Amino acid sequence: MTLAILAVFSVALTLLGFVLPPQGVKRATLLGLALALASLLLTWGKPFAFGPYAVDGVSQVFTLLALLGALWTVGLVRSGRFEFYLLVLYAALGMHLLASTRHLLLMLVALEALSLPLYALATWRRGQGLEAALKYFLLGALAAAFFLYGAALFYGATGSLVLGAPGEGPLYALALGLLLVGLGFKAALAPFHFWTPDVYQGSPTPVVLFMATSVKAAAFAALLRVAAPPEALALLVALSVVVGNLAALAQKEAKRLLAYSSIAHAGYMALALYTGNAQALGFYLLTYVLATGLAFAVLSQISPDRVPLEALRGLYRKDPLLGLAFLVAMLSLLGLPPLAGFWGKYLAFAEAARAGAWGVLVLALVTSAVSAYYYLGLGLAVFARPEETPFRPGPPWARAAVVAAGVLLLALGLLPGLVLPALAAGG
Amino acid sequence: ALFYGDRGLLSGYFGLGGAARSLGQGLARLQTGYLRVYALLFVLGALLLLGVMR
Amino acid sequence: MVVLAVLLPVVFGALLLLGLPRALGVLGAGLSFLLNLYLFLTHPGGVAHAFQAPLLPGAGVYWAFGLDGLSALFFLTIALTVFLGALVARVEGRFLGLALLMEGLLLGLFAARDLLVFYVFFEAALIPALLMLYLYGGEGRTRALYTFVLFTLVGSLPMLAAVLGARLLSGSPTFLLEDLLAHPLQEEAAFWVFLGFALAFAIKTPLFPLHAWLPPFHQENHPSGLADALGTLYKVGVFAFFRFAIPLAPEGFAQAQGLLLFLAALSALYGAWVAFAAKDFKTLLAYAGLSHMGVAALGVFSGTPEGAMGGLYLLAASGVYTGGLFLLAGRLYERTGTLEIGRYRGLAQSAPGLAALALILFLAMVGLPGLSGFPGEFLTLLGAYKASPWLAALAFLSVIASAAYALTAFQKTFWEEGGSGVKDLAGAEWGFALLSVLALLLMGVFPGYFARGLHPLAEAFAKLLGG
Amino acid sequence: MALLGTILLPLLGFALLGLFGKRMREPLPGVLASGLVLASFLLGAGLLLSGGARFQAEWLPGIPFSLLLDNLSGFMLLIVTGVGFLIHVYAIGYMGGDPGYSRFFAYFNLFIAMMLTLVLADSYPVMFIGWEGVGLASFLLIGFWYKNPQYADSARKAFIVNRIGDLGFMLGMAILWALYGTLSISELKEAMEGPLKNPDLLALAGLLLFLGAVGKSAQIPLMVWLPDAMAGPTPVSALIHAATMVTAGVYLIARSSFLYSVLPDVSYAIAVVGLL
Per residue, the 3-state secondary structure of chain C, as one string, reads CHHHHHHHHHHHHHHHHCCCCCCHHHHHHHHHHHHHHHHHCCCCCCCCCCEEEEEECCCCEEEEECCCHHHHHHHHHHHHHHHHHHHCCCCCCCCHHHHHHHHHHHHHHHCECEHHHHHHHHHHCHHHHHHHHHCCCCCCHHHHHHHHHHHHHHHHHHHHHHHHHHHHCCCCCCCEHHHHHHCCCCCCCHHHHHHHHHHHHHCCCCCCCCHHHHHHHHHCCCCCCHHHHHHHCCCCHHHHHHHHHHHHCHHHHHHHHHHHHHHHHHHHHHHHHHCCCCCEHHHHHHHHHHHHHHHHHHHHHCCCHHHHHHHHHHHHHHHHHHHHHHHHHHHHHHHHCCCECCCCCCHHHHCCCHHHHHHHHHHHHHCCECECHHHHHHHHHHHHHHHCHHHHHHHCCCHHHHHHHHHHHHHHHHHCCCCCCCCCCCHHHHHHHHHHHHHHHHHHHCCCCCCCCHHHHHHHHHHCCCC
Nearest to A181 among B28, B31, B46 (CB): B46
Q: Are A204 and A129 in contact (CB under 8 A)?
A: yes
Chain A environment of B39 (Cβ under 8 Å): 138-139, 142
Query: Which residues of chain A does B42 touch, with a Cβ-Cβ cutoff of 8 Å?
Result: 139, 142, 191-192, 194
Q: Is B9 in Cβ contact with C209 (below 8 Å)?
A: yes
Q: Give yes or no for C278 touching B (CB within 8 A).
A: yes
CA distance D162 to B26: 59
Length of chain C: 467
Q: How far is CA D83 from CA A20, D87, D115, D275, in A?
A: 111, 6, 13, 27
d(CA C170, CA C209): 33
| Separation between Cα atoms, residue C330 and residue C223, nearest integer Å | 6
Elucidation technique: X-ray
Instruction: Give Cβ neighbours of residue A204 (< 8 Å, ≥ 6 apart).
Output: A122, A124, A129, A300, A304, A305
- Whole-angstrom distance, CA of residue D103 vs CA of residue D30: 11
CB A129 within 8 A of CB A122: yes
Beta strands in chain D (DSSP E): 53-57, 65-69
Q: Is D261 exposed, middle or buried (0-12, 13-18, 19+ CB in 10 A)?
A: exposed
Quote the Cα angle for A146-A150-A152, to 5°. Answer: 120
Residues of C (282-301) whose Cβ lies below 8 Å from D: none
**φ, ψ dihedrals at C55, nearest 5°:** -115, -55
With contact defined as beta carbons under 8 Å apart, do A242 and A176 qualify? no
Q: How many domains is chain A partitioned into structurally?
A: 1
In the DSSP assignment, the letter for residue D239 is I
Burial of A308 (0-12, 13-18, 19+ CB in 10 A): middle
Closest of A55, A59, A113, A53 to residue A87, by C-alpha = A113
Which candidate in C142, C149, C150 is best for mutational testing of the B interface (most B CBs within 10 A)? C150
Interface membership of A375 toward C (CB under 8 Å)? no
Name every chain A residue with its beta carbon within 8 A of the beta carbon of C151: none
Q: Looking at the complex, does the CB of residue A414 fall below 8 Å from at least one CB of chain C?
A: no
Closest CA to A207 of A48, A321, A70, A378: A70
For residues C296 and C380, the answer to whether their CB atoms sit within 8 Å is yes
**Binary contact (C212, B17; C-beta < 8 A):** no
Residue C161 near residue A349 (C-beta atoms within 8 A): yes
Cα separation, C289 vs C205, whole angstroms: 10
CB–CB contact A353 C156 (8 Å): no
Side-chain half-sphere exposure of D146, counting CA atoms within 13 A? 25
Interchain pair C306, D58: CB under 8 A: no
Contact by Cβ (8 Å): A262, A216: yes
Which of C56, C124, C192 shows the shortest C-beta gap to A338?
Answer: C124
> Angle, to 10 degrees, between the axis of helix D28-49 and the axis of helix D71-94?
160
Chain C positions in Cβ-Cβ contact with residue A343 (cut-off 8 Å): 56
Cβ–Cβ below 8 Å for B25 and A174: no
- Taking the Cβ of residue C24 and every Cβ of chain D, the question of whether any pair is shorter than 8 Å is answered with no
Nearest to A349 among C123, C124, C161 (CB): C161
Mutate to test the interface with D, among C377, C382, C405 (most CBs of D within 10 A): C382
Interface check for A84 against chain C (CB to CB < 8 A): the answer is no
Longest dimension (CA), chain C: 69
Option in B3, B10, B17 nearest C274 (CB):
B3
Q: Which residues of C touch A372 (CB under 8 A)?
A: 146, 149-150, 153
Residue A211 lies in domain: 1-427
Q: Does B15 touch chain C (CB under 8 A)?
A: no
Rounded Cα distance, A272 and A237, in Å: 11
User: C214 to chain B: nearest residue by CA?
Assistant: B10
Contact list in C for residue B2 (CB cut-off 8 A) is: 270, 273-274, 277
* Interchain proximity B13–C274, CB inside 8 Å: no
Contact predicate A68/A289, CB 8 Å: yes
Chains D and B touch (3+ CB pairs under 8 A): no
How far is the C-alpha of C242 from the C-alpha of C239, rounded, in Å?
Answer: 5
Q: What's the CA gap between D177 and D124, in Å, rounded? A: 10
Counted domains in chain B: 1
Asked if C216 lies within 8 A of B13 by C-beta distance, the reply is: no
SS3 D99: coil
Closest CA to B36 of A189, A139, A148: A139
Give which of B16, B31, B37, B47 to mutate to test A binding, by max A Cβ within 10 Å: B31
Task: In whole angstroms, give the CA distance from residue A190 to residue A243.
Answer: 8
The subunits that touch chain D, with at least 3 C-beta pairs less than 8 Å apart, are: C
CA distance B47 to chain A (A): 9
Residue type, A164: G
User: Which of A68, A56, A59, A40 minimizes the C-alpha distance to A408?
Assistant: A68
Q: Do A239 and B23 touch (CB under 8 A)?
A: no
The span from the CA of C124 to the CA of C112, in Å, is 13
Measured distance CA(D263)–CA(D256) in Å, rounded: 11
Q: Do chains D and C touch (3 or more CB pairs under 8 A)?
A: yes
Amino acid at A369: A
Beta carbons of C293 and C205 less than 8 angstroms apart: yes
Residues in chain C with CB shorter than 8 Å from the CB of D175 are 385
Contact D132 C452 (CB under 8 A): no
- C211 vs B contacts (CB less than 8 Å): 6
Q: Which amino acid is at C462?
A: A
Q: Which residues of B touch C216 (CB under 8 A)?
A: 10
Resolution in A: 3.4
For D149, name the nearest residue in chain C, comparing CA atoms only: C416
Cα separations (Å) of A279 from A180, A348, A419? 21, 10, 10
Contact by Cβ (8 Å): D139, D175: no
The residues facing D54 across adjacent strands are D68
B20 is in which domain, residue-wise? Answer: 1-54
CB contacts of C274 in chain B (<8 Å) are 2-3, 6
Q: Which residue of C has its CA nearest to D19?
A: C353
Cβ neighbours of A239 in B, within 8 Å: 45
